[PDB]
Amino acid sequence: KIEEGKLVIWINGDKGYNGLAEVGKKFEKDTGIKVTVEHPDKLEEKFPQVAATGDGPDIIFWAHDRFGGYAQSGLLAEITPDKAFQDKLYPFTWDAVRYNGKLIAYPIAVEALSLIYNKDLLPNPPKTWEEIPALDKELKAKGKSALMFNLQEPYFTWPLIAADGGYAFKYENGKYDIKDVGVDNAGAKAGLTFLVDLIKNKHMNADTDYSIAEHAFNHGETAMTINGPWAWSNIDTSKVNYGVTVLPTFKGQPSKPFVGVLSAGINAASPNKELAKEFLENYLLTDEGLEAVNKDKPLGAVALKSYEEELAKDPRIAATMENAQKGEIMPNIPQMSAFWYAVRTAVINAASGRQTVDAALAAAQTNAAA
Amino acid sequence: KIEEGKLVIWINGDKGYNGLAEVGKKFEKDTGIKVTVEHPDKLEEKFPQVAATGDGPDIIFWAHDRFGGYAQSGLLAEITPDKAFQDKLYPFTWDAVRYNGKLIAYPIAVEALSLIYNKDLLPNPPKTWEEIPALDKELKAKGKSALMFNLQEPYFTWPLIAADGGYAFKYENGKYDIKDVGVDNAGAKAGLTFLVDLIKNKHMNADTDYSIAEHAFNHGETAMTINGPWAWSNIDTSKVNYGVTVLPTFKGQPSKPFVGVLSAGINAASPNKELAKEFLENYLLTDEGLEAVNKDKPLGAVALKSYEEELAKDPRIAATMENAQKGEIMPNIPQMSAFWYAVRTAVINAASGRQTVDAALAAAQTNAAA
Ligand SMILES: OC[C@H]1O[C@H](O[C@H]2[C@H](O)[C@@H](O)[C@@H](O)O[C@@H]2CO)[C@H](O)[C@@H](O)[C@@H]1O
Ligand SMILES: OC[C@H]1O[C@H](O[C@H]2[C@H](O)[C@@H](O)[C@@H](O)O[C@@H]2CO)[C@H](O)[C@@H](O)[C@@H]1O
Ligand code: NI
Ligand code: NI
Secondary structure, three states: OOOOOOOEEEOOOOOOOHHHHHHHHHHHHHHEEEEEEEEEOOOHHHHHHHOOOOOOOOEEEEEEHHHHHHHHHHOOOEEEEOOHOOOOOOOHHHHHHHEEOOEOOEEEEEEEOOOEEEEOOOOOOOOEEHHHHHHHHHHHHOEEEEOOOOOOHHHHHHHHHHHHHEEEEEEEEEEEEEEEEEEHHHHHHHHHHHHHHHHOOOOOOHHHHHHHHHHHOOOOOOOEEEEEEHHHHHHHHHHEEEEOOOOOOOOOOEEOOEEEEEEEEOOOOOOOHHHHHHHHHHHHOHHHHHHHHHHOOOOEEEEHHHHHHHHHHOOOHHHHHHHHHHOOEOOOOOOOOOHHHHHHHHHHHHOOOOOOOOHHHHHHHHOOOO | OOHHHHHHEEEOOOOOOOHHHHHHHHHHHHHHHHHEEEEEOOHHHHHHHHHHOOOOEEEEEEEEEHHHHHHHHHOOOOOOOOHHHHHOOOHHHHHHHHHHOEEEEEEEEEOOOOOEEEEOOOOOOOOHHHHHHHHHHHHHHOOOEEOOOOOOOOHHHHHHHHHHOOOOEEOOEEEEEEEEEEEEOOOHHHHHHHHHHHOOOOOOOOOHHHHHHHHHHHOOOOEEEEEEEHHHHHHOOOOOOOOEEOEEEEOOEEOOOEEEEEEEEEEEOOOOHHHHHHHHHHHHHOOHHHHHHHHHHOOEEEEEEHHHHHOOHHHHHHHHHHHHHOOOOOOOOOHHHHHHHHHHHHHHHHOOOOOOOHHHHHHHHHHHHH
16 A cells, blocks of 8 residues: 655656656755656556555656546546746746646656657758658668657657648637547558658668667667657767757648646545645655756646746757647547557557558547547 | 677577677677677577578577587588687587587587566465465565566467476487477376466456566566576666565476577678687687676576586576576577477466467477477
8 A cells, every 4th residue: 555654756767767767856945745756667557556555656747648647537626726836937838737626736847759760861851751762762872771760659650640730630619529539530541651661662661669779869870750758868979969949840731749737636546635735746846846857858838937938949849849739739628548558559550560540540540549 | 780899799689698798898809800689589580581592690509409400501610619718618509509519609608597576575486387376365465466478479388388397399319209299198287287277367468578578477467477597687777675485386297398498600601701700719708708798787607618507506506407407408400490389379378268278289399290
């Protein structure tokens, strides 16, 4: 069972967990309460299982999309920031963590995928997806490749799927229609078909995952990658001369990455709710707190106004916001877990040649819908 | 086309490529020849495509199993070590690189998978695969897991498949019978069935790859992993107090890891063959040469007798040889690429629920064969 008198925190391991731990040490120094930061694998799936039994972390960090489901299942404590605190963050970030009229998590940062490119290999990155095959031919002749990114998680291919018409659930007047899924319209099909053609024509490998893409980019094996702000720190360390820019267009339309608000929720089963509120409100969501995390691994555009105002001048953040503006904020509805699983299956099956793009997305639509 | 007057080397990125570059620095100093060490993704699949055209690296490093195919395809230079030099390496290593009566690569080191475990989480690691599921249940109660290893590459699952009867090709009197495959007998089925039941019962996850397992073990998230000597370096850098030991038995029989001899072959289209020979014979295959590579990432038991005599005292090396002794040296026949592809497909489909184990191995039996 969750222990009283300490805080256990779960956060994805590609985020600045060491920096978050620094905020934890500061918390312990002031309160005597020990803070343990952990990054279990597949934490976003482990949470619902263990929290159901009254176990797991006091605080869970994830993009807001998963939180509606946690809330519907009664896994989250309703949070109680007063009016002064709420005023400290951008109103739209609060909207992302609202579910059935209740705030169920604290917004931290706004994430969106960007095109990352090696300036020495590619001083002028492609403006369109359509340009990528020829770049790859040219680079292959130098023992390099044009583009590598994670093909195991649908999050990374979604921008291309959505670019020319793909969407998750139809949204009208502040309500998602869970029976109206947009993963199998002409736009979605066109997008995935292009991705699969890249693979068939040997410009990408269906096996490529996050670690393989990161290694390749950071070692100058590939000219481009697609990734979030968290990834910039490792590139800095690699001494690759990189730029961050708008994603390529597809059929003349911008790529539309799903926008995630990194959020922190409080386990409904936690006997440490007040401590968790104190930690999140008085320590983490301050200029000093977000600074420590961000210095470890960049957060992106933070929810805290005072600190975003000082990050805003960073061109990498301007590119992130530009890509966010072109994309869409993720739904937070409970149906999202089913949506993602359906799209992951379709992309893997189509990329590997197990099913046609059309069969893959037709099953995803059915699987995702109610 | 391959440039005259330099050496380009390809080696897997998880091995000691920076150490190897150091050997290259000394080679340049004595011979005037610059050495470039590269670690392309999927280098062992890319090599035959580019080599057939006269392109690629001067020297390729990979386990010996891939080299029969390269040699049969006309892509490797026959090597010419005199008897004095041949006497410096273990006779069985030369056997691994002999194909159609010709030596086709220089043996470097002998690799075998071992069980690696965290002595603090699990001071008493299992003697059997069979006690793993309950150990996992027990570790889950403490917020950890029992075992994580790469489920994307069949190499890592093979020891379990073979433990109780699985095999690649029937071997008799120095000849492999390529029409007699053993991936679909009672033993192979039992092995794969145990693995799939692990995943089914949430003791492992089918998506787990090399980077995920390494991250998990090196951060104290899981009590055990399965990996080779090259992995020990990063574990040393980690906080983890670890041990390396014999793999668990299955149905009472030892796990049977395929044993690879890391070997260096010379591209048949290299205009630098004499230089490649001098590099490999007079620089790399010396105590000082292998020490430089080994200090970067452990090689395993090396092929050079003089140096292996110094490494043999290492209990990690003792465990490596014990597991190797219980396993089988891989065939080097051209048919091995089709074997591995067939097995990869079977494990991924079985582990993910796409096919039953029986249907997966039934298919693999026929695909692997001729
Ligand atoms: O791939 C599906 C996955 O997408 C999103 O997860 C992101 C997460 O938002 C990012 O912060 C980062 O960690 O990468 C993840 C993708 O690997 C959704 O948030 C998630 O629910 C969904 O499963
Ligand atoms: O997984 C199939 C794969 O197994 C072997 O590859 C090993 C290699 O021998 C090791 O040195 C290390 O790099 O890990 C590899 C597995 O990821 C075979 O040598 C290879 O041909 C085969 O594809
Ligand atoms: Ni982790
Ligand atoms: Ni590499």
